[PDB]
Amino acid sequence: MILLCIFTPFLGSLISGFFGRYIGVNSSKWIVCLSIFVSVVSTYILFIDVIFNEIEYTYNIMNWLNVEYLVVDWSFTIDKLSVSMLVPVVTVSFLVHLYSVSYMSHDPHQQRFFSYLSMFTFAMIVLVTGDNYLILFVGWEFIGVASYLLISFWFTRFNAVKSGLSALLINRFGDALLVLGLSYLVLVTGSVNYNTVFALGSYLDVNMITVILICFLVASMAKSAQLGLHSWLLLAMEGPTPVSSLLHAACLVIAGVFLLMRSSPLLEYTPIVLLLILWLGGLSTLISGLIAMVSNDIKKIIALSTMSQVGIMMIAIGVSCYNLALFHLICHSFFKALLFMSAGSVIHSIISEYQDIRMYGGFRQFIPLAYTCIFIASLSLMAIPGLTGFYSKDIIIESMYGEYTFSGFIIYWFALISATCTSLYSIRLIYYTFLNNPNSPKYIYINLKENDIVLITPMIILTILSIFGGYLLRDIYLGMGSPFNELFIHPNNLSLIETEFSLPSILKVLPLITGLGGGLILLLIYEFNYSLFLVYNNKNLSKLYSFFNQKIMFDQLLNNLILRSGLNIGWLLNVHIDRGILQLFGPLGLWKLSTFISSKLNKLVFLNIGFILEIIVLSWLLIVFKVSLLKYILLLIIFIIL
Amino acid sequence: GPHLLREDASFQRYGQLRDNLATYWKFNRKAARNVFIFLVAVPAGLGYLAYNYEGKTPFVGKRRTEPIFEQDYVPRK
């Protein structure tokens, strides 16, 4: 049963990869969808056994590394944390593959697309089920490999090609730090196995623990697109929408969160790292929402929402509330995949295939089913009470105030603004696409029709999960005293109770008031008083609008300064070292020295009695001179060469 | 063979130059500044880090001999 959950998507990758030429376009897509579905049913069967019956599965294929004390096995273990992670991964992957059957039906290369999509699914299953960090790193790298091939899938497009490289290189920067953390783990503990390392967490030096997890923190930022290594995330929109619906929902963007939750037995014994995770998450929630309120591409707006929500998971980990982070991780994968799916529905429906909300407007009637999915998913994203996002996001924001520390209070306002900005950019996206006066040509609206049932079916399934799912699963992850020993919480760090009993009732509804009250005010201005949003008039507003629309000018600073100077250093080394001083102290320099010396010696070979007689008689001075003068004669001779 | 590559004169001139940058390199003040940084300054920086911590980091099975969490809480009011 465990081998079925892990390796069945890998067989689907092989079939559409090598046998796609032989089974054709139609059957290749569905056989890959068959392989993912087998993993879906296998995962659900294992979910009952693990979570509800406390049964662990472990399959040890064979040994990988056997160098003295360092022993690494090809083992996969499924426990509460691992099987919980498979629930968003495998379920959303299946509903994205089934979505891609009709979305990609016009693409000339569909066997390759479903091969990369299923290979990506297999890598993510490997990451969360490996019994040690090296097996996690194997999935960690091949997620980046598969993300590179998916983002650059349309490789004739120059933008998609450079975007796939950008995602690969930034993640490979995170991999270089993850390798160092694993090397330090072998140095301090002698092992990478979870069972060995996690037993020693209390007895290891704090500095050793801090070094390992700082390396893990840098790797986490690259994959989860936290501030500093978040530039590739919006470039990842160059891939097909099914890639976005998968990468940004239950996949690569959540890998960094998993790495930190897995390391909780170690991460709890280093407050300094947890403080950094808190602040880095808080900064990225604030910045993502502010950028998303003046963004105009529909997929970029949703992508920035993904970055904002992952930062909500980081602040939960920062206050050592790992259980809340895992629960919000599962719930977010449902209604964020829905938002990407329902965005791709609108883009396909409009016959011009625009992606700019400024070219949309008045779509609500013509595509009512697409509007309903976005509406419910946005309300779930906006943590509207009763919905799945409400049971996972409201508690995380309130936990910042429940910390009663300086950092917790600062990050509460950052989270509160991000919660308010979430409502703002959700209403703005809905107004421009659906409720605004039509900006598209009249010909677009007479042809604006809903897509087929294969596209619709996964959206309906995810729509229900975005309504009820959080309420059903809340007690497993958020219930007080619920045993989740994989996520270790130190007794000094338990704040779930003061979060639940000590907060004022004004703060219990403050995120709800600002989002609902602020959203209505924003909606009125568009419909009735749009003259306030002609920001090109005011020069200060134009500069403030331009700063956030250009994403805090980070991409410009990265390319123009860090990447330009990184390539220029190679040029300076190439010019002044390899082709420079190493040639002067090499072939070119010695050739000039040889030519100068050999030209002097060529003038001394000529048949002349007086010349050789003078040299013979001159040599007699070596007999006359005392031998201490030899080095002065040597210096004199070198002068004559010149 | 059948000359399957459409040879470009500007490509050939550019490629020939990139291979032959050594001919025009001058050991001027700009070249000397980069030579000092790459072959003297940076190696010295790594040179002093390597021997400063030569045998000064016994990090194998390093133990924790000091508490992490505070026992008592003192309010700020």
Binding site: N560, L561, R564, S565, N568, W571 | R13, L17, L21, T23, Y24
Partner: peptide, 28 residues
């Protein structure tokens, strides 16, 4: 308006290799 990237020399001397103003082809 439009400006060249950093680390682009304003002059060079590589023998008889033609000397031309640097044009960032991304802006064409």
């Amino acid at each position: 308006k439009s400006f060249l990237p950093h680390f682009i020399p304003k002059n060079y001397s590589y023998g008889d290799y033609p000397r031309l103003k640097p044009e960032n082809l991304q802006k064409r």
